[PDB]
Structure formats: C-alpha cells, structure tokens
Amino acid sequence: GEELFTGVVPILIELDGDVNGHKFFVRGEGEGDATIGKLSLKFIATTGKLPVPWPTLVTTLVQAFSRYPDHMKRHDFFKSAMPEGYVQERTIYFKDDGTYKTRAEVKFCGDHLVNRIELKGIDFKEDGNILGHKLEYNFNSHKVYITADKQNNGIKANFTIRHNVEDGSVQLADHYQQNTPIGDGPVDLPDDHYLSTQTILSKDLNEKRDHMVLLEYVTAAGI
C-alpha cells in the first residue's frame, strides 16, 4: 500500500474530453514523490488547441502522492487502495456557467502509476470565462476537505477552486468528489481532514504543441 510510495514513482495521465461537443485528448507524464508531497508533470493536448483553458483541467489531471505526515498515516485512503487502485469521480460546477463530470481510474501498471480519465462538460456559455478563454494561466492554493464514506468503503471530498479571471474577477468551481477502491481487501477510512495544495503552472519555451507544465505540493493536515 504505502510501501509503493517510499520513492519516486513515474506517472502517465490520459484524459479523453468532450465539452459542449468539442472533443479533445490530453496526455501527461512525469513523476510523484509522496515522501515530500511533490508532483512534476508535463501535459500535451494531442488534438491541437484546447477548447477550454488549461487551469480548468488541473484538478482532474493523483492524490495518492499527497504527503501524509507520520501521525496521520492511518488516514491515507489513497495509498491504501494500491496497487489495484481507486475510481475517482467528480461533478464540478462552474458558478454562473457549465458543469464538468469526470470519472477516473487511478492504479499501478507495473512500476508506474496511471490516471485514466473521461470528462464530459455541458451547458457552458459561449463567451463565458471557460469557452471564452478568459482565465489566467495560474493556480491558487486550496484546502480539499475529506470525509469517510463507510457505505462505499471509500471517501468523499468537497472544495471550491478559485480561478483568476483576466479582468480581475474570480471564477469559482465547486467540486464534489467520490473515491471507491477497485480491488477487494481492506482500505483505510479516515477521520475528517484536509489536503492543503499549492500549484504552479508554466510553459516549456522549446515546446510548440499546446501544453502545460505543472509543479504541485500537497500535504495532509487537520488531525
């Protein structure tokens, strides 16, 4: 379980997307180090220019790499579901705009962790901040609130992402999340806690394809 995360783990990410009928595919690679709670990844849109801004996809595009400090180990659901993995599902409500629905499988393939995601988005406004590409290329820090869902032998989470808009306003995205283990056996159901997240988005200046370089630090807290 946790024993699979004592060192650096290579990551492959795939996202098959469809927002208001605009189809796209994103592929990411890099590495995660759960001992420090660090993720370094590069994402490419293989279908050309995205119909939505990169920041809207960040939350979707491996919380198993969160640093859980020693006293909180017993509360790390994400690692305890490995290698078989977990399903992660979300509904994301963009305030005054459309919604994303996502379903992902996060599991080991041999020595590498893979996150495979399907995303469907509906009811977005033409000129809105999302389809109008009015969101800044950056990301804020958040708290991801996690609670046990004993019925499903898993967890739920709730949080609101704050996306900065070009005109100086903020676009809120309310996230509702569920995770359930894929394989049989026991998993760790946690007491209430949160993950504190920080993310930096950048560009590779030699990369001509549409892309996003990401560095994140996440540490669990609240117990």
Q: Which residue ranges make up the site for Zn ion (CB under 5 A)?
A: 109
Nearest residue to Zn ion by CB is 109
Nearest distance from residue 114's CB to Zn ion, in Å? 5
Between 109 and 170, CB nearer to Zn ion: 109
Q: Give dist(CA 115, CA 12) in Å, integer.
A: 6
Nearest distance from residue 112's CB to Zn ion, in Å? 6
Most distant CA pair in the chain, distance: 50
Nearest distance from residue 64's CB to Zn ion, in Å? 16
Q: Are 83 and 187 within 8 A, CB to CB?
A: no
Closest CA to 63 of 22, 106, 119, 93: 106
Between 58 and 113, CB nearer to Zn ion: 113
Question: Mind giving me the DSSP string for 154-215?
Answer: EEEEEEEEEEEBTTS-EEEEEEEEEEEESSSS--PPPPSEEEEEEEEEE--TT--SSEEEEE
Between 7 and 110, CB nearer to Zn ion: 110
Nearest distance from residue 7's CB to Zn ion, in Å? 18
Helix (H, G, I), strand (E, B) or coil at 105: strand
Q: Are 198 and 17 within 8 A, CB to CB?
A: no
Between 14 and 136, CB nearer to Zn ion: 14
Between 83 and 132, CB nearer to Zn ion: 83
Q: Give dist(CA 165, CA 126) in Å, integer.
A: 16
Nearest distance from residue 108's CB to Zn ion, in Å? 9
